[PDB]
Amino acid sequence: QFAQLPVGFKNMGNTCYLNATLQALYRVNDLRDMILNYNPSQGVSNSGAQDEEIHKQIVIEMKRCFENLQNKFKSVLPVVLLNTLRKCYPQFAERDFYKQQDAEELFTQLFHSMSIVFGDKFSEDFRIQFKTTIKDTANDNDITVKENESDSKLQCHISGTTNFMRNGLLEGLNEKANSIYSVEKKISRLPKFLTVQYVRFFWKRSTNKKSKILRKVVFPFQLDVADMLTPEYAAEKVKVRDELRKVEKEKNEKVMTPREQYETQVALNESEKDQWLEEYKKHFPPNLEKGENPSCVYNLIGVITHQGANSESGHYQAFIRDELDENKWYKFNDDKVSVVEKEKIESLAGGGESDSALILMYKGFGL
């Protein structure tokens, strides 16, 4: 009666890559907020970027789109945003409709633009820092440790052996006169928002053509990455996790018109949610960096899926967890929005030609 369905973006013809990506970004609370409050008078953070003005326009056009989503405009047509994106990143103007594109490539370029415009305020929420150990496979006294590698996502490598996301994340942290060196990353700083890429798209050698790995790879709703951290950082994050678990457990224990009553209940539920956020926050570590995850645990909040033979075919969708009711998920099939249950989300692990998870977004536990 009173609860309104979220709205989606109309597909202009092979532009579901953009639509699914925008829903996932909109779900990231801090990002949504900084875009919604962006004032062009504020300029950009990185005015070393030669194309500064077009990045600012990308943000402006995102803000307009986000204003239309927030204020539910039954359908949003991101025409000007697409044109703007194409001016900045001509790869997205390739034809053959315009050609279908890899959502990962869009995600990456949008991250670049948002980093130019907002700076550290944006990028610190996503930064993963590594401690890298570099050993000569032929000599285990030749050891070098580096602390300066970082990224804004983790890659989940998928081969025929891969059955769970953890398997692929662990493989992604390792790689290999001249010698073969093993290069082994452990995480020394976790972000509050953790993006995971399933490496599904690849160049098939046999056919000289783009293809896709269809293998089922199970992801968890609650992700714990303690085993990917340096020993020193794990000790810190596990201590936090164990206090947060105690709060979670304690939480699980505990004349107006009909419209007015609904609006009062929403207000009550938001207050109760905020009181629990404050209870978790009491246990956050004292020297936590802005944008850093307090613990080593995350909850899943969004999934970008793809169905089709390769990154230039088929269809992308987003599945987004409701911000209050953690059991509720929304399916954004462009402008067709529906409510689905946890079982439908689990089925996105893949296997065969089914719609399957490509990019996963996790938010830190207790946030």
List Cα–Cα distances, 108 to 104, 271, 359, in angstroms.
6, 36, 12
List Cα–Cα distances, 194 to 127, 236, 292, 297, in angstroms.
8, 18, 10, 10
Decide: 228 and 187 in contact? Cβ < 8 Å: yes
Catalytic-role residue among 55, 157, 306, 315: 315
Q: 116 phi and psi, to 5 degrees?
A: -60, -45
112 in active site: no
**Cβ-based burial of 231 (10 A; exposed 0-12, middle 13-18, buried ≥19):** exposed
The distance from CA 320 to its chain's CA centroid, rounded to whole angstroms, is 11
Catalytic-role residue among 16, 65, 88, 156: 16
315 in active site: yes
The H or E element spanning position 329 is strand 329-333
Angle between helices 29-36 and 103-118 (to 10 degrees): 60
Decide: 113 and 325 in contact? Cβ < 8 Å: no
Q: Which residues are catalytic?
A: 16, 315
